[PDB]
Short mmCIF file of C-alpha atoms and ligand atoms in Angstrom, two decimals:
data_model
loop_
_atom_site.label_atom_id
_atom_site.label_comp_id
_atom_site.label_asym_id
_atom_site.label_seq_id
_atom_site.Cartn_x
_atom_site.Cartn_y
_atom_site.Cartn_z
CA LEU A 40 145.84 -15.41 41.59
CA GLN A 41 149.08 -14.22 40.00
CA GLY A 42 150.55 -13.79 43.46
CA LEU A 43 150.41 -17.21 45.08
CA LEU A 44 150.02 -19.59 42.18
CA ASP A 45 152.10 -20.36 39.11
CA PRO A 46 150.08 -19.81 35.87
CA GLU A 47 149.21 -23.46 35.18
CA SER A 48 147.99 -23.95 38.76
CA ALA A 49 146.02 -20.70 38.50
CA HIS A 50 144.43 -22.00 35.33
CA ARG A 51 143.38 -25.36 36.81
CA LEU A 52 141.83 -23.51 39.74
CA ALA A 53 140.04 -21.12 37.39
CA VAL A 54 138.62 -24.03 35.38
CA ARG A 55 137.54 -25.77 38.58
CA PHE A 56 135.80 -22.73 40.10
CA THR A 57 134.19 -21.89 36.77
CA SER A 58 132.92 -25.44 36.35
CA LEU A 59 131.50 -25.53 39.89
CA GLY A 60 129.54 -22.35 39.16
CA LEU A 61 131.18 -20.68 42.18
CA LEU A 62 131.34 -17.32 40.41
CA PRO A 63 128.34 -14.99 40.54
CA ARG A 64 126.25 -14.77 37.38
CA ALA A 65 126.99 -11.68 35.27
CA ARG A 66 124.72 -8.70 35.92
CA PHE A 67 125.09 -7.15 32.46
CA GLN A 68 122.21 -8.28 30.25
CA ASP A 69 122.79 -8.21 26.51
CA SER A 70 121.01 -5.60 24.40
CA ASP A 71 119.75 -6.63 20.96
CA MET A 72 122.57 -4.49 19.50
CA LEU A 73 124.96 -7.28 20.36
CA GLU A 74 123.11 -10.00 18.48
CA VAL A 75 124.83 -11.61 15.50
CA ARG A 76 123.56 -14.17 12.99
CA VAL A 77 126.31 -16.12 11.29
CA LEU A 78 127.46 -19.74 10.67
CA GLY A 79 123.80 -20.77 10.61
CA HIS A 80 123.24 -19.61 14.16
CA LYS A 81 122.21 -16.72 16.32
CA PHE A 82 124.78 -15.41 18.82
CA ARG A 83 123.31 -13.36 21.62
CA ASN A 84 126.55 -11.37 21.90
CA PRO A 85 129.71 -11.57 19.76
CA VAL A 86 132.19 -12.17 22.57
CA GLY A 87 133.34 -15.75 23.04
CA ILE A 88 135.95 -17.56 25.12
CA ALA A 89 138.85 -18.74 22.91
CA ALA A 90 140.08 -22.33 22.71
CA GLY A 91 142.66 -23.26 25.32
CA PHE A 92 140.88 -22.23 28.48
CA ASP A 93 138.46 -25.15 28.63
CA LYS A 94 140.56 -27.65 26.71
CA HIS A 95 138.47 -30.63 27.82
CA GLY A 96 134.90 -29.29 27.99
CA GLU A 97 134.66 -29.25 31.79
CA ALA A 98 133.43 -25.70 32.32
CA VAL A 99 131.15 -24.94 29.39
CA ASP A 100 128.11 -23.93 31.44
CA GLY A 101 130.12 -21.85 33.90
CA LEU A 102 131.50 -19.99 30.89
CA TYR A 103 128.02 -19.02 29.61
CA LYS A 104 127.11 -17.94 33.14
CA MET A 105 130.21 -15.78 32.97
CA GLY A 106 128.50 -13.96 30.11
CA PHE A 107 130.18 -15.24 26.94
CA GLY A 108 127.92 -15.34 23.89
CA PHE A 109 129.55 -18.55 22.70
CA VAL A 110 132.04 -21.09 23.99
CA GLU A 111 134.79 -22.90 22.17
CA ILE A 112 136.38 -25.94 23.79
CA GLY A 113 139.62 -27.69 22.81
CA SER A 114 141.94 -28.33 21.27
CA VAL A 115 141.09 -31.99 21.49
CA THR A 116 143.37 -34.69 20.11
CA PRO A 117 142.06 -38.15 19.12
CA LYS A 118 144.03 -40.05 21.79
CA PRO A 119 144.78 -38.63 25.26
CA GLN A 120 148.22 -37.06 25.65
CA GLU A 121 149.96 -35.09 28.37
CA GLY A 122 151.67 -32.40 26.31
CA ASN A 123 154.99 -30.75 27.13
CA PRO A 124 156.81 -30.94 30.48
CA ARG A 125 156.14 -28.23 33.08
CA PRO A 126 156.61 -25.32 33.33
CA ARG A 127 154.96 -24.64 29.99
CA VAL A 128 153.09 -21.40 30.55
CA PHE A 129 154.47 -18.02 31.59
CA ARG A 130 153.11 -14.63 32.61
CA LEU A 131 154.60 -11.40 31.22
CA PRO A 132 152.73 -8.90 33.45
CA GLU A 133 154.64 -5.83 32.16
CA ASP A 134 153.37 -6.68 28.67
CA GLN A 135 149.91 -7.88 29.66
CA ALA A 136 151.02 -10.98 27.78
CA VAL A 137 151.37 -14.73 28.14
CA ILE A 138 153.67 -17.29 26.53
CA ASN A 139 152.62 -20.94 26.48
CA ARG A 140 153.92 -24.24 25.13
CA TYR A 141 151.33 -26.77 26.38
CA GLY A 142 151.58 -28.99 23.31
CA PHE A 143 147.96 -30.13 23.15
CA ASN A 144 147.53 -31.63 26.60
CA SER A 145 144.24 -33.42 26.03
CA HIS A 146 141.86 -35.88 27.67
CA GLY A 147 141.17 -37.09 24.11
CA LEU A 148 138.08 -37.55 21.93
CA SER A 149 136.32 -40.34 23.91
CA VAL A 150 136.41 -38.54 27.26
CA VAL A 151 135.34 -35.21 25.75
CA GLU A 152 132.60 -37.00 23.75
CA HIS A 153 131.10 -38.63 26.84
CA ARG A 154 131.38 -35.36 28.73
CA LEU A 155 129.49 -33.40 26.03
CA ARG A 156 126.92 -36.18 25.59
CA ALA A 157 125.95 -35.74 29.26
CA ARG A 158 124.69 -32.20 28.57
CA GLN A 159 123.91 -32.52 24.85
CA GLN A 160 120.19 -31.65 25.12
CA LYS A 161 121.01 -28.80 27.50
CA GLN A 162 123.39 -27.43 24.86
CA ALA A 163 120.71 -27.78 22.15
CA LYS A 164 118.54 -25.46 24.16
CA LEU A 165 121.40 -23.02 24.79
CA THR A 166 122.16 -22.95 21.05
CA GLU A 167 118.51 -22.27 20.17
CA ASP A 168 118.74 -19.55 22.77
CA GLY A 169 121.66 -17.92 20.99
CA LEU A 170 124.52 -19.50 22.95
CA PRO A 171 126.39 -21.76 20.47
CA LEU A 172 129.20 -24.23 21.17
CA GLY A 173 132.39 -24.64 19.15
CA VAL A 174 134.83 -27.53 19.33
CA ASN A 175 138.48 -27.07 18.38
CA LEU A 176 140.27 -30.14 16.92
CA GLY A 177 143.94 -30.96 17.25
CA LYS A 178 146.39 -33.64 16.19
CA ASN A 179 148.32 -36.11 18.36
CA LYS A 180 152.06 -35.58 18.72
CA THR A 181 153.05 -39.02 17.38
CA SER A 182 150.31 -39.13 14.76
CA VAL A 183 151.40 -40.34 11.33
CA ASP A 184 148.44 -39.06 9.25
CA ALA A 185 147.40 -35.54 10.26
CA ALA A 186 144.28 -35.56 8.10
CA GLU A 187 143.07 -38.80 9.68
CA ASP A 188 143.40 -37.27 13.16
CA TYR A 189 141.18 -34.39 12.09
CA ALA A 190 138.83 -36.79 10.32
CA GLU A 191 138.39 -38.77 13.58
CA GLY A 192 137.61 -35.54 15.39
CA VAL A 193 134.99 -34.53 12.86
CA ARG A 194 133.28 -37.92 13.26
CA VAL A 195 133.32 -38.12 17.03
CA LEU A 196 132.75 -34.48 18.10
CA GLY A 197 131.28 -32.95 14.94
CA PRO A 198 127.81 -34.30 15.87
CA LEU A 199 128.03 -32.47 19.23
CA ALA A 200 129.26 -29.10 17.93
CA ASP A 201 127.61 -26.06 16.37
CA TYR A 202 130.93 -25.43 14.66
CA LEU A 203 134.17 -27.32 14.38
CA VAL A 204 137.64 -25.72 14.21
CA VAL A 205 140.48 -27.29 12.29
CA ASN A 206 143.43 -26.03 14.27
CA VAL A 207 146.46 -25.93 12.00
CA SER A 208 148.22 -22.95 13.63
CA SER A 209 149.42 -24.16 17.00
CA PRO A 210 153.08 -23.23 17.39
CA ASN A 211 153.71 -26.01 19.93
CA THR A 212 153.43 -29.14 17.76
CA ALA A 213 156.24 -29.97 15.31
CA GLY A 214 155.15 -29.63 11.68
CA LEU A 215 151.55 -28.58 12.40
CA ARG A 216 151.77 -25.06 10.97
CA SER A 217 153.03 -26.46 7.63
CA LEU A 218 149.47 -27.82 7.22
CA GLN A 219 148.65 -24.19 6.37
CA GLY A 220 150.51 -24.71 3.07
CA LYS A 221 148.33 -24.70 -0.06
CA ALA A 222 148.62 -28.33 -1.26
CA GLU A 223 148.52 -29.77 2.26
CA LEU A 224 145.69 -27.49 3.35
CA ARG A 225 143.53 -28.37 0.34
CA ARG A 226 144.02 -32.09 0.86
CA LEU A 227 143.35 -31.91 4.60
CA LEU A 228 140.23 -29.75 4.29
CA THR A 229 138.82 -31.80 1.43
CA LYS A 230 138.90 -34.83 3.70
CA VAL A 231 137.51 -32.88 6.68
CA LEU A 232 134.62 -31.47 4.65
CA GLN A 233 133.79 -34.92 3.27
CA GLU A 234 133.52 -36.33 6.77
CA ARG A 235 131.45 -33.36 7.86
CA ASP A 236 129.10 -33.79 4.89
CA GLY A 237 128.59 -37.45 5.79
CA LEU A 238 126.93 -36.50 9.09
CA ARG A 239 123.15 -36.39 9.50
CA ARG A 240 121.80 -32.93 8.84
CA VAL A 241 120.77 -31.84 12.34
CA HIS A 242 124.25 -32.92 13.54
CA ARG A 243 126.16 -31.15 10.76
CA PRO A 244 128.46 -28.36 12.07
CA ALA A 245 129.99 -25.41 10.26
CA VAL A 246 133.72 -25.98 9.67
CA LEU A 247 136.29 -23.22 10.32
CA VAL A 248 140.07 -23.01 10.01
CA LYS A 249 142.21 -21.35 12.70
CA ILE A 250 145.31 -19.69 11.27
CA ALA A 251 148.51 -18.21 12.62
CA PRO A 252 149.38 -14.50 12.83
CA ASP A 253 152.83 -15.26 11.41
CA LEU A 254 151.89 -16.07 7.81
CA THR A 255 153.63 -14.67 4.73
CA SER A 256 151.54 -12.75 2.24
CA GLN A 257 151.73 -15.88 0.05
CA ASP A 258 150.36 -18.17 2.80
CA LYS A 259 147.44 -15.81 3.29
CA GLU A 260 146.58 -15.61 -0.43
CA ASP A 261 146.74 -19.38 -0.72
CA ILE A 262 144.54 -19.90 2.32
CA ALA A 263 141.91 -17.47 1.03
CA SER A 264 142.05 -19.25 -2.31
CA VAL A 265 141.51 -22.72 -0.80
CA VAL A 266 138.85 -21.48 1.59
CA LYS A 267 136.86 -20.09 -1.33
CA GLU A 268 137.51 -23.09 -3.55
CA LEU A 269 136.28 -25.65 -0.96
CA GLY A 270 133.55 -23.52 0.62
CA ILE A 271 134.99 -23.58 4.13
CA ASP A 272 132.48 -21.87 6.41
CA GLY A 273 134.86 -19.55 8.22
CA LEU A 274 138.19 -18.52 9.63
CA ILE A 275 139.47 -18.02 13.14
CA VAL A 276 142.09 -15.30 13.13
CA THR A 277 144.45 -15.66 14.92
CA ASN A 278 146.35 -18.12 17.06
CA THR A 279 149.36 -17.15 19.20
CA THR A 280 152.52 -15.73 17.60
CA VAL A 281 156.02 -17.25 17.53
CA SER A 282 157.35 -13.73 16.93
CA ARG A 283 158.63 -11.55 19.77
CA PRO A 284 157.73 -7.92 18.97
CA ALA A 285 160.30 -5.26 19.83
CA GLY A 286 159.57 -3.72 23.21
CA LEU A 287 158.61 -6.78 25.30
CA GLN A 288 159.66 -6.05 28.90
CA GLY A 289 158.80 -9.30 30.72
CA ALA A 290 161.69 -11.32 32.12
CA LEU A 291 160.29 -14.48 30.51
CA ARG A 292 160.05 -13.00 27.02
CA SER A 293 162.57 -15.47 25.60
CA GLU A 294 160.70 -18.60 26.64
CA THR A 295 159.84 -20.86 23.73
CA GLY A 296 156.16 -20.93 22.82
CA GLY A 297 153.29 -18.82 21.59
CA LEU A 298 152.77 -15.22 22.63
CA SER A 299 149.23 -14.06 23.39
CA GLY A 300 147.66 -10.91 24.80
CA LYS A 301 148.19 -7.23 24.08
CA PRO A 302 151.45 -7.56 22.09
CA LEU A 303 149.49 -9.73 19.64
CA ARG A 304 146.46 -7.42 19.27
CA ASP A 305 147.31 -5.32 16.21
CA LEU A 306 149.17 -8.12 14.42
CA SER A 307 145.97 -10.13 14.76
CA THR A 308 143.71 -7.24 13.67
CA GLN A 309 145.84 -6.70 10.58
CA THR A 310 145.50 -10.44 9.74
CA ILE A 311 141.72 -10.20 10.04
CA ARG A 312 141.81 -7.15 7.78
CA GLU A 313 143.87 -8.93 5.14
CA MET A 314 141.77 -12.15 5.22
CA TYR A 315 138.46 -10.25 5.03
CA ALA A 316 139.69 -8.47 1.88
CA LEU A 317 141.20 -11.61 0.27
CA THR A 318 137.86 -13.35 0.82
CA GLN A 319 135.78 -10.40 -0.38
CA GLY A 320 133.96 -10.21 2.93
CA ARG A 321 132.07 -13.44 2.07
CA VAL A 322 133.76 -15.62 4.68
CA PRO A 323 132.83 -15.18 8.37
CA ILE A 324 135.80 -14.40 10.61
CA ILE A 325 136.11 -14.90 14.33
CA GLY A 326 138.64 -12.33 15.51
CA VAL A 327 140.94 -13.20 18.36
CA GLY A 328 144.21 -11.93 19.87
CA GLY A 329 144.77 -9.37 22.63
CA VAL A 330 141.15 -8.27 23.11
CA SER A 331 140.77 -6.60 26.59
CA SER A 332 138.24 -3.87 25.87
CA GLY A 333 135.29 -2.74 23.76
CA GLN A 334 137.60 -0.74 21.51
CA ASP A 335 139.78 -3.81 20.93
CA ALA A 336 136.68 -5.78 19.98
CA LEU A 337 135.24 -3.07 17.73
CA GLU A 338 138.51 -2.59 15.88
CA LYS A 339 138.48 -6.31 15.01
CA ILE A 340 134.81 -6.16 13.96
CA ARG A 341 135.42 -3.09 11.76
CA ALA A 342 138.46 -4.86 10.29
CA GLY A 343 136.16 -7.73 9.31
CA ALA A 344 135.41 -10.03 12.25
CA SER A 345 131.77 -11.04 12.79
CA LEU A 346 132.65 -12.44 16.18
CA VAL A 347 135.50 -12.09 18.66
CA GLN A 348 137.13 -14.17 21.35
CA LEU A 349 139.42 -13.45 24.28
CA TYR A 350 141.55 -15.55 26.57
CA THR A 351 144.67 -13.81 27.95
CA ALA A 352 142.82 -10.68 29.18
CA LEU A 353 140.96 -13.02 31.53
CA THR A 354 144.39 -13.81 33.08
CA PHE A 355 145.04 -10.25 34.23
CA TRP A 356 141.56 -8.80 34.76
CA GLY A 357 139.47 -11.85 35.71
CA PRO A 358 135.76 -12.44 34.90
CA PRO A 359 134.67 -8.75 34.98
CA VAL A 360 136.45 -8.15 31.67
CA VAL A 361 133.62 -9.94 29.87
CA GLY A 362 130.97 -7.44 30.93
CA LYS A 363 133.40 -4.57 30.49
CA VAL A 364 134.12 -5.54 26.88
CA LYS A 365 130.39 -5.97 26.10
CA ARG A 366 129.37 -2.67 27.74
CA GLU A 367 132.12 -0.70 26.01
CA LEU A 368 131.34 -2.39 22.71
CA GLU A 369 127.71 -1.25 22.96
CA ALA A 370 128.64 2.30 24.00
CA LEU A 371 131.12 2.59 21.09
CA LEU A 372 128.59 1.24 18.60
CA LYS A 373 126.09 3.95 19.58
CA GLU A 374 128.78 6.64 19.51
CA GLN A 375 129.93 5.76 15.99
CA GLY A 376 126.48 5.52 14.47
CA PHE A 377 125.97 1.77 14.14
CA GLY A 378 122.57 0.24 14.75
CA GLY A 379 124.36 -2.86 15.95
CA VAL A 380 127.30 -5.25 15.72
CA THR A 381 126.15 -6.46 12.29
CA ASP A 382 126.37 -2.99 10.68
CA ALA A 383 129.94 -2.57 11.90
CA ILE A 384 131.33 -5.83 10.47
CA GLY A 385 133.85 -4.87 7.80
CA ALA A 386 133.00 -1.15 8.04
CA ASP A 387 136.69 -0.18 7.74
CA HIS A 388 136.65 -1.62 4.22
CA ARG A 389 133.78 0.62 3.13
C1 LIG B 1 147.43 -20.95 27.60
C2 LIG B 1 146.85 -20.94 26.21
C3 LIG B 1 146.43 -22.13 25.63
C4 LIG B 1 145.88 -22.12 24.36
N1 LIG B 1 145.46 -23.29 23.78
C5 LIG B 1 144.89 -23.29 22.51
C6 LIG B 1 144.45 -24.49 21.95
O1 LIG B 1 144.55 -25.55 22.56
N2 LIG B 1 143.90 -24.49 20.69
C7 LIG B 1 143.79 -23.30 19.98
O2 LIG B 1 143.29 -23.32 18.84
N3 LIG B 1 144.23 -22.11 20.54
C8 LIG B 1 144.78 -22.10 21.81
N4 LIG B 1 145.20 -20.92 22.38
C9 LIG B 1 145.09 -19.64 21.62
C10 LIG B 1 143.89 -18.81 21.98
O3 LIG B 1 142.74 -19.55 21.64
C11 LIG B 1 143.97 -17.52 21.17
O4 LIG B 1 144.05 -17.90 19.81
C12 LIG B 1 145.21 -16.66 21.50
O5 LIG B 1 145.63 -16.82 22.84
C13 LIG B 1 144.99 -15.16 21.22
O6 LIG B 1 143.93 -14.63 21.98
P1 LIG B 1 144.24 -13.89 23.39
O7 LIG B 1 145.29 -12.82 23.15
O8 LIG B 1 142.96 -13.28 23.91
O9 LIG B 1 144.74 -14.88 24.42
C14 LIG B 1 145.75 -20.92 23.65
C15 LIG B 1 146.18 -19.73 24.24
C16 LIG B 1 146.72 -19.74 25.51
C17 LIG B 1 147.18 -18.44 26.12
C1 LIG B 2 145.60 -13.38 38.37
C2 LIG B 2 144.49 -14.33 37.96
O1 LIG B 2 144.98 -15.66 37.89
C3 LIG B 2 145.39 -16.22 36.63
O2 LIG B 2 146.58 -16.09 36.38
C4 LIG B 2 144.32 -16.77 35.74
S1 LIG B 2 142.79 -16.22 36.19
C5 LIG B 2 141.91 -16.99 34.94
N1 LIG B 2 140.54 -16.90 34.78
C6 LIG B 2 139.69 -16.90 35.83
C7 LIG B 2 138.56 -17.67 35.88
C8 LIG B 2 137.81 -17.63 37.05
C9 LIG B 2 138.17 -16.83 38.14
C10 LIG B 2 137.33 -16.78 39.39
C11 LIG B 2 139.29 -16.05 38.08
CL1 LIG B 2 139.88 -14.94 39.38
C12 LIG B 2 139.98 -16.11 36.93
N2 LIG B 2 142.79 -17.69 34.18
C13 LIG B 2 144.13 -17.65 34.54
C14 LIG B 2 145.18 -18.34 33.75
C15 LIG B 2 144.84 -19.11 32.65
C16 LIG B 2 145.79 -19.74 31.87
C17 LIG B 2 147.12 -19.57 32.18
C18 LIG B 2 147.45 -18.77 33.26
C19 LIG B 2 146.50 -18.15 34.04
O1 LIG B 3 148.32 -26.73 23.16
C1 LIG B 3 149.04 -25.72 22.91
O2 LIG B 3 150.09 -25.56 23.57
C2 LIG B 3 148.54 -24.64 22.17
C3 LIG B 3 147.72 -24.86 21.07
C4 LIG B 3 147.30 -23.79 20.27
O3 LIG B 3 146.54 -23.98 19.32
N1 LIG B 3 147.76 -22.50 20.53
C5 LIG B 3 148.63 -22.28 21.61
O4 LIG B 3 149.04 -21.15 21.86
N2 LIG B 3 149.07 -23.36 22.38
#
């Protein structure tokens, strides 16, 4: 509740209620129009919950009950760490936006591993039922070897994930976004893919890279190049922005951190559009940033996303926004002549 609670307290409460299943199960049932097959899995609908809401994998099942077609947990760092001092998250209600600088507060790999192991066979059934699980990997603040942090994550949580996310676009960890550079990115992902390939086949996840919305045209070309060279399975586009677009009204607009929500929407859609084209439409993209409606989702899908995620809209509109986005997405697909989600992926480019 934006009234009583500060944002971080509201978030903890949200996670708690969601994990305890206290919310009613969604009434909207998914039509076959919403089904997507990508990353070696079936997704019953293309609307997922973005990393950062369930950082430690405490609410996964509550999130499916909420109606998401897939769930991404994380980011998870190898060792536990508390992240930045409070306050570190801020509401900009006049912008339908949020700024955060958590800094990878994480329970760490071991705790998350044990937590996911407790429901591992339950998740295997959910996945076969079209409800996949992603795990987002981060790096410890004081870590000396970034690649080794990610390698650890691949080894410990890779066996429990349908897909893994190499998060190299968080704005709240010194030096992390420079891992998006060509030489550094190639070296890092080579190591990550090696570790992933060393896992037993039924425990072998797709590997995706999550990139910033603040990249130069050169960064983007280089990333597409490396992605195609190493055979990375996909891209998550995008993380929060360190920019502050003209027009922000919120009093807290000059807080340090990453901006999410509606002011990020089109910046993120344009990044999807550019990455889809640079990768010739052969690399699956999960579109994320300021989705709050069916139209927002469909614009990202037409720009090239096969899947979409939201987080910040859930801050202003609560759980109903999930059904709303799915219902509108279906209505818009019919209106514009698409048989389903799959036919609309990349349609803007044709
Ligand atoms: C409070 C908060 C925490 C987040 N934490 C993470 C994170 O730990 N790892 C990550 O890859 N993205 C994180 N994100 C980014 C979201 O996953 C998403 O990329 C971004 O917020 C844009 O989507 P949105 O506008 O729907 O919120 C976080 C976002 C917010 C608002
Ligand atoms: C106004 C709603 O309260 C919030 O601000 C909320 S509300 C929310 N999701 C959420 C989840 C479950 C319930 C029952 C409700 Cl109701 C909301 N998440 C946040 C939040 C998350 C991260 C940072 C800040 C806030
Ligand atoms: O932990 C963070 O603060 C965080 C990570 C991330 O990937 N994106 C974000 O906006 N914040």
